[PDB]
Amino acid sequence: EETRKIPVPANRYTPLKENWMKIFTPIVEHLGLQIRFNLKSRNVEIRTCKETKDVSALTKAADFVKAFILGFQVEDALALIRLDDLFLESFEITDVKPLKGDHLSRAIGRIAGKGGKTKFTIENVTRTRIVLADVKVHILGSFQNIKMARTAICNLILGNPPSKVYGNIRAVASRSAD
Amino acid sequence: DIKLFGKWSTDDVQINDISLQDYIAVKEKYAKYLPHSAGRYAAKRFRKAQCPIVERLTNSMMMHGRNNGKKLMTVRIVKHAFEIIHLLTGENPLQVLVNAIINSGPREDSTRIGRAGTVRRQAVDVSPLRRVNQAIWLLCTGAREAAFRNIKTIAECLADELINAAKGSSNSYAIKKKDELERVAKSNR
Amino acid sequence: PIKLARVTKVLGRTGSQGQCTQVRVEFMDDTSRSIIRNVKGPVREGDVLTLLESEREARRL
Amino acid sequence: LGPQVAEGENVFGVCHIFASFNDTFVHVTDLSGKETICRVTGGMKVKADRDESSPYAAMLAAQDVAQRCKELGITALHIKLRATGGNRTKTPGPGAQSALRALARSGMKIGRIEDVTPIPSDSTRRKGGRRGRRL
Amino acid sequence: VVADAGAFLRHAALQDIGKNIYTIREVVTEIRDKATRRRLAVLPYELRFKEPLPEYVRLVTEFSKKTGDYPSLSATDIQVLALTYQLEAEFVGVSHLKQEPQKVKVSSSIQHPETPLHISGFHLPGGWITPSNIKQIQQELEVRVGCLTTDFAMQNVLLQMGLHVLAVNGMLIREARSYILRCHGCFKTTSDMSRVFCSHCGNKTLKKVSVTVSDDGTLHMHFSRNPKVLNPRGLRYSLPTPKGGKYAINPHLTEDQRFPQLRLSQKARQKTNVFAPDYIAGVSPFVENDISSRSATLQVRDSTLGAGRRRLNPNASRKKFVKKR
Numbered sequence: 008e009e010t011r012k013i014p015v016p017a018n019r020y021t022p023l024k025e026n027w028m029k030i031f032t033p034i035v036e037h038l039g040l041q042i043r044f045n046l047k048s049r050n051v052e053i054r055t056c057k058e059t060k061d062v063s064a065l066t067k068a069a070d071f072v073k074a075f076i077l078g079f080q081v082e083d084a085l086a087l088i089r090l091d092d093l094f095l096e097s098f099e100i101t102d103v104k105p106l107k108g109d110h111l112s113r114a115i116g117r118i119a120g121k122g123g124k125t126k127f128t129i130e131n132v133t134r135t136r137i138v139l140a141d142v143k144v145h146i147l148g149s150f151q152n153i154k155m156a157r158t159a160i161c162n163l164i165l166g167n168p169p170s171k172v173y174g175n176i177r178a179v180a181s182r183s184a185d
Numbered sequence: 186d187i188k189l190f191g192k193w194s195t196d197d198v199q200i201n202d203i204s205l206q207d208y209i210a211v212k213e214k215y216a217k218y219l220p221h222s223a224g225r226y227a228a229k230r231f232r233k234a235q236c237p238i239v240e241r242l243t244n245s246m247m248m249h250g251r252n253n254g255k256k257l258m259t260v261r262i263v264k265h266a267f268e269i270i271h272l273l274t275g276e277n278p279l280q281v282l283v284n285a286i287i288n289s290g291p292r293e294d295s296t297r298i299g300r301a302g303t304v305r306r307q308a309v310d311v312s313p314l315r316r317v318n319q320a321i322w323l324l325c326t327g328a329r330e331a332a333f334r335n336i337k338t339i340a341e342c343l344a345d346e347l348i349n350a351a352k353g354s355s356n357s358y359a360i361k362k363k364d365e366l367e368r369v370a371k372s373n374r
Numbered sequence: 375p376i377k378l379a380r381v382t383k384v385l386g387r388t389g390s391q392g393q394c395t396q397v398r399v400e401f402m403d404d405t406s407r408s409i410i411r412n413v414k415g416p417v418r419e420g421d422v423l424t425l426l427e428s429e430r431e432a433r434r435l
Numbered sequence: 436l437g438p439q440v441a442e443g444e445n446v447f448g449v450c451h452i453f454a455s456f457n458d459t460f461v462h463v464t465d466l467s468g469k470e471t472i473c474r475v476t477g478g479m480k481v482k483a484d485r486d487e488s489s490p491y492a493a494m495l496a497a498q499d500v501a502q503r504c505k506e507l508g509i510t511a512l513h514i515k516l517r518a519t520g521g522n523r524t525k526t527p528g529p530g531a532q533s534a535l536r537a538l539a540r541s542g543m544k545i546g547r548i549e550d551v552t553p554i555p556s557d558s559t560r561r562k563g564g565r566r567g568r569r570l
Numbered sequence: 571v572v573a574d575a576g577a578f579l580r581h582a583a584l585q586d587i588g589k590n591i592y593t594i595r596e597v598v599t600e601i602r603d604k605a606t607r608r609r610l611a612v613l614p615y616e617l618r619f620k621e622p623l624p625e626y627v628r629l630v631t632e633f634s635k636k637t638g639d640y641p642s643l644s645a646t647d648i649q650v651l652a653l654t655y656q657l658e659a660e661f662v663g664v665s666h667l668k669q670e671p672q673k674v675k676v677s678s679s680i681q682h683p684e685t686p687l688h689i690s691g692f693h694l695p696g697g698w699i700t701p702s703n704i705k706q707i708q709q710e711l712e713v714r715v716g717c718l719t720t721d722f723a724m725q726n727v728l729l730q731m732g733l734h735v736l737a738v739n740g741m742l743i744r745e746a747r748s749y750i751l752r753c754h755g756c757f758k759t760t761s762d763m764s765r766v767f768c769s770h771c772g773n774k775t776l777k778k779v780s781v782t783v784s785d786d787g788t789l790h791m792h793f794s795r796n797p798k799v800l801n802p803r804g805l806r807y808s809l810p811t812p813k814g815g816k817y818a819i820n821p822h823l824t825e826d827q828r829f830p831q832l833r834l835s836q837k838a839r840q841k842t843n844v845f846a847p848d849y850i851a852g853v854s855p856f857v858e859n860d861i862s863s864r865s866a867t868l869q870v871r872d873s874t875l876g877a878g879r880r881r882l883n884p885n886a887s888r889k890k891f892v893k894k895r
C-alpha cells in the first residue's frame with residue numbers, strides 16, 4: 008500500500024477543521040481511501056486500501072487536499088476529484104517584475120480590485136479560480152484557461168490598469184473559440 | 186375491416202426500424218378509409234406524429250403555390266400513384282411508402298453553432314420526427330421537380346420516386362439529397 | 375456500425391439561434407453508458423434515435 | 436532482460452520529471468541517478484513547437500517511459516519534480532502534474548514525491564529588466 | 571421507542587426493532603426537510619401520535635429547571651420527555667425512576683478547550699477513516715420502551731432521571747460526553763453550542779467546558795486550568811459612534827440588537843455542485859461569480875465568512891495596505 012502526505016500551515020488548520028467532513032467524505036465514499044490528520048507532524052495522510060476503485064484515485068485525493076490547503080474552496084477542489092483536465096500552476100508576484108515594499112503591495116491590490124471585483128471578473132472570463140496567498144498567486148482550471156489567467160494577472164502586476172486588462176482578456180476569450 | 190381506399194390492407198405492413206415505429210402511424214389504430222380527414226394536427230407540438238403518413242404525403246404535395254388549396258385533387262393523385270405502385274410491385278403500397286420514408290430520411294445534418302460569421306458547421310444528429318418530415322418533403326419535391334415539363338403525370342413520377350426510394354436505388358432525388366447532406370455532415374463532424 | 379440510442383432526459387436548447395437540442399442518451403445495447411448529445415429538430419423525453427457514431431461526445435464543458 | 440528478482444520486491448528507479456516553461460522532460464534513471472533508463476521530452480511526441488509544453492505531450496511521454504520501464508523490468512518509481520529555478524519560477528507547471536498523474540495511471544507503483552528544484556540561497560540577476568517581463 | 575425529530579432527520583429506519591413507536595404531531599410537523607417528508611409518506615404507518623397528561627409535563631418542568639437544562643430544551647422536547655415518562659409510567663412501575671438529581675462534581679485539567687480530542691480524523695501520535703468506519707462514526711456508541719434523542723440536553727436530563735436512552739444504534743447508551751458553554755460572569759450554563767451571548771446576563775462571555783453523564787445519574791464537569799482562556803486582551807477597544815441607515819454595521823454588542831438587512835444576491839450565495847448529474851454539460855467548471863449586483867458593490871459578505879479576522883484583537887497591527895471592510 009502506498010500513501011501521500013500533504014502539509015498544513017498554521018493559517019490553514021482552522022479551515023481544515025471546520026471543513027473536515029466535506030473533505031473526508033468524498034475521499035472515502037467516491038474514491039474509497041483511508042485518510043487521517045497527523046497532528047504531531049501536521050500532515051493530512053491519504054492511504055490506499057482494499058476498497059479503492061482504481062489507480063490514480065489517490066492522486067486525485069492528493070490534488071483535492073492540496074488545492075484546499077492552498078486556499079481554494081472545497082467545492083472547487085471537488086472539481087479536482089471529478090474532472091481530469093484541471094491543474095494548478097502558481098508563481099510569486101516578483102517572478103514577473105522586481106517589486107519592493109509598497110509597490111509590491113499595490114501589485115496585490117490591483118490583482119484583487121475593490122471588493123475583490125477584478126479577481127472575480129478574471130475568474131468569470133477565464134473560468135478559473137485564483138487564490139492570492141501572501142505574495143503568491145495560484146490558478147486552477149484548464150491549461151489554456153490557466154495561460155489566459157496568467158496573461159491577465161501578469162499584465163496586472165507589470166503595471167497596466169484593470170480596464171485595459173478587462174478589454175484584452177475579453178478579446179482573447181473571443182478569439183479563443185470560447 | 187378498415188382498408189385504405191376500400192381495398193388496401195393495413196395489418197400486413199411492418200415497420201423495420203424501432204426509431205420510426207412510433208412516428209409512422211399507419212399500422213392498426215390510425216388506419217383510415219381516406220387520407221382526407223381535415224383534423225387539427227397542427228394544434229399543438231408533436232400532434233402531427235399521430236397523423237397517418239398518407240395524409241402527410243397528401244398535405245406535402247399540395248404545398249406548392251398554385252395547388253395551395255386543392256386537397257381533393259391531391260388525394261386523387263395519391264390514389265392513382267398507390268394504384269400504380271400495386272400494379273408495378275404487387276406489394277401492399279403502404280409498406281412501399283414506409284420503406285421509402287425510412288430509407289430517405291437523413292441520419293445527421295450540419296448546423297451553424299456559434300454566431301453569424303462562423304461558417305464552421307457542426308454535424309449533429311437529427312430528430313426522428315424531423316427525419317420523417319424531411320423524408321416526406323424530399324419525396325414530394327422530387328416528384329414535383331421530375332414532372333414539371335414532360336409527358337409523365339405527377340402521380341406517375343410520384344410512384345416512380347417511391348419505388349426508387351423504397352428500393353434504395355440512386356435514381357430518386359430524395360436519396361441523392363440524403364446522401365449529400367449526410368456526406369457534408371460527415372465532412373464536418 | 376450503427377448504434378441506436380434512447381433519450382433519458384432533455385438538457386436544453388443550445389446553439390446560435392436555439393436550433394440545437396442538448397439531450398441525455400441511453401443505449402439499448404444493455405449498457406448504462408449515458409452520454410450527452412446535440413440533435414436538430416423537435417425531441418422529447420422518450421424519443422428513440424439512430425446514432426451513426428457512438429464515439430462522438432457533445433460539447434461538454 | 437532485467438533484474439532477477441521475485442514478484443514481491445520492487446526494483447525502484449528514480450523519475451526526474453522536469454517541467455520547463457517551454458517543454459517537459461521525463462528521465463527515468465537508477466537510484467544513484469548516474470545511469471539512465473529512459474528520457475522522453477515533450478517534443479518527441481507533438482510535431483509543433485507550440486505544444487511542446489502541453490499536458491498532452493507530457494501524458495504521451497509518460498506512457499512512453501512507462502512502456503520502456505516495463506520492457507526493462509522497473510516496477511516502481513521515486514519521483515523528483517522540478518521547475519527551472521535559480522532566478523526563474525520555482526513552482527512546477529501543469530506539465531509535471533500531468534506527467535505524474537498519467538504515469539501513476541499506467542500501472543506504476545509510486546514511491547516518494549520530492550521537489551528537487553534549484554532554489555538559490557541568494558540569486559544572480561533576473562533575465563528580465565527592471566521594466567518587467569511576461570507581456 | 572419514542573422517536574425524536576433527530577431520528578426522522580437522520581432517516582433512522584428503526585421501526586422494525588421496537589413496537590412502541592410513538593411521537594408528537596408537533597415534532598413531525600415542524601420538519602422543514604423535503605426528503606424527510608417524502609420518506610414519511612413512504613414508511614409503513616405503525617407509529618401513533620399522542621399528547622401527555624399535563625401533570626407529568628409540570629413534573630418534568632420542575633426538575634428540568636433544577637438540573638440546569640431548562641432554557642436549552644424546547645416545548646416539544648418537554649413533550650417528548652413527558653411522553654416517554656408517561657409510557658414508562660404506564661408500562662413499567664414508577665418506583666424505578668428517581669427525582670432531585672445529584673449534585674455535579676468538579677475536576678479541572680490543563681488541556682485547552684479547543685484541543686481537538688474526540689474528532690474522528692485527528693490523531694495525536696492508528697486512527698484512520700476507512701470506508702468501513704463511515705456508517706460506524708455517529709457518536710459515542712455503546713428494553714421495551716426507549717428514546718431516539720440526539721440532542722445532548724435530552725440525554726442529559728434522561729440519564730439524570732434514570733430513563734434508559736438508546737441511539738440510532740439499537741443498543742442503549744451508557745455514557746454520554748459532550749461540551750457545554752458556561753458564563754464566567756454569572757455562572758449559568760447553556761447546552762446550545764451555537765449561542766454566543768449569555769441567556770441570563772447577556773454578555774459575550776460564554777466559554778467551553780466539557781461534561782459527561784453516566785447511566786447511573788452522575789454528571790461530572792471538566793474545566794480547563796489554562797490562563798489563556800480567561801485573559802482580557804482585545805476586549806477593551808474604542809468603538810465608533812452608533813450609525814443608522816440602510817448600510818450601517820454596528821459592532822454587534824447585544825444578542826437581540828437590530829441590524830439593517832444586507833443580504834447577498836441569490837447568484838452570489840450559490841456554490842458549485844459537482845456531484846450533480848447535469849454538471850458535465852455545464853459550460854464552466856465553477857459557478858460564475860456575482861459582479862453585477864448592488865451587494866457586490868456594497869461588498870456584502872456571508873456571515874460565516876471572515877471569522878479568523880474577528881478573533882484577531884482590535885488593538886493590534888494589521889498590514890499597511892489592507893482595510894477591514
Ligand SMILES: [Zn+2]
Nearest residue numbers: 753756768771
Ligand atoms: Zn452570563
